[PDB]
Design a binder for these strands. Structure first.
Ligand SMILES: Nc1ncnc2c1ncn2[C@H]1C[C@H](O)[C@@H](COP(=O)(O)OP(=O)(O)OP(=O)(O)O)O1
Ligand SMILES: [Cr+3]
Ligand code: NA
Ligand code: NA
Length: 327
DNA sequence: CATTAGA
DNA sequence: TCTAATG
């Protein structure tokens, strides 16, 4: 956690670098299980060999470890960090829309900077177009103070279109969290469950509403179940406008909201921990349901959910307020 | 790990 | 169809 830290992080940087700048998934994979195992190691790694004894620790990695332990740096590391080319892919990548692949190509053609991106907007696709447009606002945190405002709006139109809509803004925001990155609104409706052959419009109607009133301003990607866009809080009485924000609304078969909700609420650990728990307690939990476990090793059969509760109950746990789902 | 764009 | 990018 801190005794193995430097090693891990160097490794992760290492790992990372392969995966993007280079097209080396394998090495990249190498760096991770290693960085994975060495992390759990109960003692201060003190030399490569020591490290080496470890499963996943090759001769190569070890060699790096020594040089890092011996000298507070790493060459390949300093050299990467420096390397303008790699620097660029690492950068371009920030654009929502851009990924490693396209990052390398942009470079290959010469677009290293944001500006280049500008002059060559032609070369970018609508997603990345919006990516480039709101570059700044995309990086910004979302003050819960605003979360309340957006959340507020979203609920109204939802209900305003059809009262049957249920809707939750999941994420850190649900978890209290002073700020959040993007807004996750979960959604469902009775008339839409497991079997009941969809009702696309379901999603569509709202998307239309929120836009209608100018909440949603940009569409990054709308599907029959997953809408992904840009929104922005009304700019009051001029002098202060709102930063354009990332937003995702997802349609759900009401017969699996809860789990889904539970799930997206997090945290990463609470889930996991909660998940591991249901196991002993003879169950299984995942993004959409909770099934009773069978001794034959495994088994099916989806239990019935009415609220975050039922689930809690099932595994016979103590209801954890979102606020406290932190771990 | 599943859902969308695009080509 | 597959291949990228988001989550
Ligand atoms: C998984 C992790 C979360 O529980 C959930 C998705 O939330 P995620 O998209 O990561 O929210 P977030 O961290 O991106 O945004 P936020 O800023 O709202 O917390 O599913
Ligand atoms: Cr989010
Ligand atoms: Na080994
Ligand atoms: Na990106």
């Amino acid at each position: 956690e801190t005794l193995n830290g430097g090693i891990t992080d160097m490794l992760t940087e290492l790992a990372n670098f392969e995966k993007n700048v280079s097209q080396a998934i394998h090495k990249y994979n190498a760096y991770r299980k290693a960085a994975s195992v060495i992390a759990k190691y109960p003692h201060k790694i003190k030399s490569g060999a020591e490290a080496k004894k470890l499963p996943g620790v090759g001769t190569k990695i070890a060699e790096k470890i020594d040089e890092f332990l011996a000298t507070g740096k790493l060459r390949k590391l300093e050299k990467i960090r420096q390397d303008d080319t790699s620097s660029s892919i690492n950068f371009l990548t920030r654009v929502s829309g851009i990924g490693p692949s396209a990052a390398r190509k942009f470079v290959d053609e010469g677009i290293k900077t944001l500006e280049d991106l500008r002059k060559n907007e032609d070369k970018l696709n609508h997603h990345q177009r919006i990516g480039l447009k709101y570059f700044g606002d995309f990086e910004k945190r979302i003050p819960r103070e605003e979360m309340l405002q957006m959340q507020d709006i979203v609920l109204n139109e939802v209900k305003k279109v059809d009262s049957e809509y249920i809707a939750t803004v999941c994420g850190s925001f649900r978890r209290g969290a002073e700020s959040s990155g993007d807004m996750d609104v979960l959604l469902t409706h009775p008339s839409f469950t497991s079997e009941s052959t969809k009702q696309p419009k379901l999603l569509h109607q709202v998307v239309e509403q929120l836009q209608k009133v100018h909440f949603i301003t940009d569409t990054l990607s709308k599907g029959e179940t997953k809408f992904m866009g840009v929104c922005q809080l009304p700019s009051k009485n001029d002098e202060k406008e709102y930063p354009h924000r990332r937003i995702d609304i997802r349609l759900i078969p009401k017969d699996q909201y809860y789990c889904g909700v539970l799930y997206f609420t997090g945290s990463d650990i609470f889930n996991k921990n909660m998940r591991a728990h249901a196991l002993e307690k003879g169950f299984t939990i995942n993004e959409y349901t909770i099934r009773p476990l069978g001794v034959t090793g495994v088994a099916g059969e989806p239990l019935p959910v009415d609220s975050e509760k039922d689930i809690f109950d099932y595994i016979q746990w103590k209801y954890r307020e979102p606020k406290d789902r932190s771990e």
